[model samples]
Target: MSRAYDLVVLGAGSGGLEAGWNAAVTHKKKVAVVDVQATHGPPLFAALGGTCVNVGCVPKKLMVTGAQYMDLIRESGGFGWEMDRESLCPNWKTLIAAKNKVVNSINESYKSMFADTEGLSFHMGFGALQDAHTVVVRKSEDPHSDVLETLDTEYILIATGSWPTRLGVPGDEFCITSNEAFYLEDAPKRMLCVGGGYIAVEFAGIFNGYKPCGGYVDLCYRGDLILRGFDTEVRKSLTKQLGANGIRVRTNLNPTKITKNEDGSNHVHFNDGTEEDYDQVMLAIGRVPRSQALQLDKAGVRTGKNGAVQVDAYSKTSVDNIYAIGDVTNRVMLTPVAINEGAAFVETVFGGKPRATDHTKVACAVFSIPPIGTCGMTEEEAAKNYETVAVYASSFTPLMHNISGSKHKEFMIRIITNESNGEVLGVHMLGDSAPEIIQSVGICMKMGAKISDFHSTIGVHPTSAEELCSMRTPAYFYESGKRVEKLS
Candidate 1:
């Protein structure tokens, strides 16, 4: 049977489901959301809550917390508490099971969100765009499967998110990506995480945490540095701390090939005359859009390089009556960004209010051993956009670290402001609670807070946050990419 709706949303991830729920519940618009229930196990549709809950943010963060215990338990001695380090070992099965339960609850919550809405109907299947006004959903994963239902709608939305891409090398099949790591029966005994993107760096931290308790991990990146596009000082500090945390860092090498060893481990041959054996190899090279399976070409939707959907400032596609959001659009590509984009779509299309997602200063976090939280422009970003940029960078041991007695912890805060207007341009930090710290600072930047405002505000004493409010001097200034030192 065929049906008609006001909107047909494809891919039930954060962006897709947000648009669907708001449009149906808030605006009372007829909506249909089609996405699969499983984001794991074969990965045809990627789950209801999508990557964040299944294999990306949710699971990764859970493991990161588990990993933090390695340092926390060890450092307790400084606080006059003795720990039995020899008796401690991380149970990968217990952690994975707990995380999977959390993921499953989120999946059911997405379902309940749709079911509770009067005008919203949810379907479990793969939604492919047949045209600008039609969607064909196949209940089965196979492409040759018959269409389970055909929906004709006034508007179609593509919110299909991206997937992790593996490296191209012989015996790459013996390797895994972040997708498979969540379900592994045991932590990797000896793992070599390839590429140096955020995913690679994050997993290295997660696995490294297990090393003291269990598995051994190495982080190898092809770039000159691990993190490519972060503030120079923070990224440099993070690179150093990875070594302090006991994860070996290798730079300027790409995996050329992989061969199976006699002991069932794999030998990785790098671009240089270097080779090493690892029980498990992870390819965190990059990710690409989930647009290929959605048959977007049939609907005349224009996609950019790597299948990222081309959307206007309003999230409207090349073809009228169609739109896209989230990672598939490649705009910011963060969970909160995707959720905001979805809300903007509902406001623009159904709520009778024209809204565009503000993608500026989207704060992001990297859950490394010493995590990172950043908001606003980098020094490099600010120098190009503004006439003169003032940089204030501070690296010091936090109050907790002062007594924790763990050299594994490092903290830095760098603030950038426009010299002319005194407007804060960037707020960045690396250490405990950086993500939470940067989140609030990001709001201040959005409100256009200047250096004077931060300086004038009374800081909560004896806390890492006070560092932002206490910095008075400029470390240096940059104009047109040229540095002007603050000579005493």
Candidate 2:
């Protein structure tokens, strides 16, 4: 165990795998990845890729799809297509099983990647840092309970990622995190979700989909959409749409307690002197840094006040020989951003080429009732920075909306730009496929594209995304806060 590896990676999630892969191929470094789980990558994806592959994003999306279809069926009558009211409900058990299969397969594939790849080995069980340059892995399955493997490395990277945080209050156990919501035996007769973030909104929408026919669901958040960093109008409008759809929303409210009722349901008390009866409750509050259990202090790895690892541009931790990435470092906390940081660290430090990550205006999405996609600054920020900022926008009932007759509308295509720089400062939209359509546009903005380019482009017919091409009029020029027309 005395031989020093060229590179040592910890918690083989997305960041770790990307970094380890780069080290092995780019620098020919002997890399060993240590994780407590018997899998190669993300623990949630032990049979797949990582948390995103199995437990988090993948499963959540499937559940969302089912929920969406339920709404679609309810609106079918509006489109002149009759839907059997009975056929509109989702088969909860069947959906969960399907989600499990996909997650398990993804985890297994990640394990296979580590096994077949040369110069990399996976450790089963937890790993603790013994020193700045050494890690001690405790093998859980080893027959001899005392067995421990102490290994030395020239380089160490921390990428353990985050976990869902619990809402601080009594009877919190009665509420489940996003993780546990995926496996409920039966749909709750009523559901209460607290939080205003993306996770909170998503679960709220999916939960409401279960009760299309005279049932109840409630979503409570301490602030507005709480998705604070986007176009102001779209954010507010989504709140309006959610309320109109029968999902009771309590904003600027907090939970006091969740009490179990004898009728096999739950009674939820809010800070606002209000109480509600529900069958189940979920708290999609948020996540915290997953750095505590790594024995970080023993390794001299410094963390922020919030317990997130403090790392440099090169992803190097306080200990120069060690590094950290992903949610563990709280550096952007997106899968793509983490992978990019991990790769940059390898190229600059190990491959003898220097590169740093650039995460400005990195696109973001939230799968709410009307999904959202945002890139760059909000309308608020653009106004503050420029002498004159123009806002262009559009809204309508999408073709699907017209037929669904669900009393719901989708808002799409909002752009914020600066008059001085002529640069497209922000792009925002809400509706189905907004995320997919804005993805490429976000890249163009990142590459320094201007709003003029959007004007010059030709339109595609009938598709919802093409609405972005029709934004010619200025809804407002922020300086004086009055309606104005586009210069061209």
Candidate 3:
């Protein structure tokens, strides 16, 4: 007979690991984390501490930094930092080496956590739902071939993260996902990036900022590219900024075929009758839940339209005693959100009190050229929900930008408030470091902070983050009729 545990986390990604770690330590319950890979943790999806650490955030950010610095190099003459263009070579090898070292260290840390934790075991293999409370472990030396063993458990958590989706367009073979972008041997001179999600936009920015001389990065999306489904002004402003940076932005243009010529270059043809030749093409479109391999349906769990495991407020699935978190649920796929949900799920089930996951006014950032951080209802969302809403906003160049001479360092701050009670509904920003900046402000908005609270706070001097406190004077407060007020 197989051994049993109080909690079984089906996927050992960031969410699953958090679930397992917290359940074992906090609740003092026996927890087992099962993953379908060589290691008992996040693999190609990320490095060791999960995707954000290994593959997604750290590595991607390193490349983004390379590109950003290259742009700064171009702006050096204007910034009074005189450097010969020939001597300003950035060794990508160095960046990759540093990133790989960090990922390796993180992978080891996760391994240590599983070993040191009192009641936690990291099972390195594919975990299949043998039944509601039974999981079959399948270990593979080569990810494709593995044997299985059934184990019993009291509860199961499906925090299996999502993976990149394939675009049905022909010659998709020529394109690669964001996961593989990190392992590139040589950067391309010119490339076409398809899709416009946060992933696509960030990569486009990465490509735009760092490419070699005569290098061009064209971004083609079937819809609005930069932070689509965001507040209209935020999206539009970002769209303009991205375009101004020489990234050819094509909206509503769907790619039909990609063909490689004799010279090993790619020719991309879009449905809009436009054609572009490039050295490489990347599809950063979106991701699908990594649930199919888990045999979730056998355990009577239902998945949503995007193949995400359907779960309730408590992260419980249709099948009792089963739960899910992170990208697997398709609710909010950000790394931090996954970590939050995982930690919360443990407390709800094992901590002797049930706590529901709260997504109300969730804040997230898109690391586009001007990073966009957003919380609560968007401008469009506010318009639909409220009879009278006020739009308080400001757009200006940060002090650093004035010296950097990079026309691109523009910040947009907006507070969507209710006209009746001066209640702040949403806090949104699209500029540098908006992610970390808005993450803090999101706390205030969630606690029912009012527009007055935002106006009252004093700003820090010569800092981009201070804009959040200084946007009291609005471009125009649209409550029934627009009233333009000059910001003092």
Candidate 4:
């Protein structure tokens, strides 16, 4: 016998939870959410709230916060606040324990909230599509056990999310991805990170204090520039800043093989005939969508590259009764984008309302050291799309740096505006508290705030954010990459 539900959501990540919640509470539909106790690998400790809560965002930000305090202590002496520098050292064990505690609490909170929801039910097992309207839930612990159950649903949603990609070279087993980094028993004395993405950069920053490893950090990127697709200036600034922060960045180099040494160290061989040894090698190359085991072909669901479920703008898959959102669709992989798509799905299918998520001009942040917060177009993108683009930018030493007597600290702020209509096309910033500040500015840009609106606004005194409202003129105008000498 098959249990039936009005809505059955596969994967209990942010996207799936939001869809199930909206359908159950808002539309009074019977909703059942099926999520595996494991993601990508073994059922080690995968919990209710998914990656953001358990591994990705929450733990990463906490670790960043912990790492920042160590820097603060080091800089405190410069601020006329004398402390024993020799005695000040971060306890990695304590920090990791606290981070894990918070993650567990959040997981419990999510479980409690789900239990309180009236028409919502959560199944802790691996869920697969048996057909367009039928789902098979198998025991995560004992997949071969006779405890299989089928769920018949009017609507089905796939939000399984993504996992880190392997290095695909020799001795790949010796390397660890960001997923396992959070649970490390102890910090490696020497570490080499393979990739230039934000995750790799942030991890390097978090471990910047490791004895010889942090000072000997090597961030290898296969591309010409790190953080590709971002503002060119920001990319260049970050590259230079990372170097200044003691991270040796090598671009245009791809790893060919990783070989273990006699002393348990690993030697990383590059395509360019270069080899380097490190206590640990972390692969942050990229992530792959978790769609392979879904048996999507059985339901006639089409998937595109990277095994991402192909979906329309309305989050509907090729099969009319099925839909997919989040990283699984390979759309905007951010958690908020997934949540928006989930809500749109509930509105369209359950509430007799049709809405689509606006993928364009979405706000995002990269929590690199001297973190990045940005929204909308890049200078390169703006010039390419608009006939005339105006760029206003400023860079200076942040007040905190000055107060702390840190001369090396600097922050950058840039605004890309459409010259014809004075619309704020994009806003990008790199510095302290950037992620927090840009989130507020994103609200203005989202509401179609013009460049003039920013200029006319009153500036707050003695703040980094005040600079946004203080720009009076374009530093330069550009039709392409070069500055405009003469315009029509």
Q: What is the per-residue lDDT of model 4 for residues 1-488, given as tens digits with 9 covering 90 to 100?
A: 34479989998888988999888998888999987653322235445676677778888899988777756777787778886767765678888888877877777777787779999998877788778889888875344645567888888998888888887778889898888888877877777888888799999888775433234677888888998878889999989988887778889988888888888888888979788888888889887998877788988999889789988899898998899988889876988999999999888888787998889778899988778989999988898868888999899897677777566667898999988888998999998888889997888888898989988989779888888888977788886556884566
TM-score against native, each model: 0.96, 0.91, 0.92, 0.94
C-alpha lDDT values of all predictions: 0.82, 0.76, 0.76, 0.83
* Candidate 1 RMSD to the correct structure: 2.1
Q: Which residue pairs in candidate 1 collide?
A: 38-47, 39-46, 39-47
Which candidate should be chosen as best, given TM-score against the real structure? 1
lDDT of 2 by residue, 1-488 (tens): 45668777887767778888888876778898876564322323332244565456777888888788766676767867765666655667777777777766666777777778777777655667879878878754333444467777888888777778887787898887777777777776678888888788888888777553556888888885667777778888888888897678878888888788888787888888788887788888777887766778887988885689988877888887898888888866877888898899988887687898987878988888778988888877777756678888888887767667754776667898887777898999888888898899888998897778887888888888777767777776776443455543
Residue 24 lDDT in model 1?
Answer: 84
Q: What tens digits encode model 3's per-residue C-alpha lDDT throughout 373-483?
A: 888887767756675677887888866666666767688888888767878888888877788888888789778888788758888887777766665554555545434
lDDT of 2 at 357: 90
Cα RMSD for candidate 4? 2.4
Going through the candidates in order, what is the number of backbone clashes in each?
3, 10, 4, 0
* Poorly placed runs, candidate 1 (over 4 Å): 1-3, 38-45, 140-142, 212-215, 486-488
Q: Write the per-residue lDDT of candidate 1 for residues 1-488, one digit (tens) a residue.
A: 34479998897777888888888888888898887764344444277776776778887888999988878887887898876758777777788888877877777776676656799887778788777788999976566888899998998888888988876668878898888877767777788988888888888888887653455678888878878788888888888888888888989888888889888888988878688888888888778988877777887888888999999988999987899988999876888888998999988988887997778877888888888999889889899979888998888876677788765576789998998899998888999989989888888888888989988999888788888888889988987667888522
- Native-to-model Cα distance after best TM-score fit, residue 40 in candidate 3, in Å: 11
Query: Candidate 3, clashing residue pairs?
Result: 35-125, 47-54, 47-55, 67-210
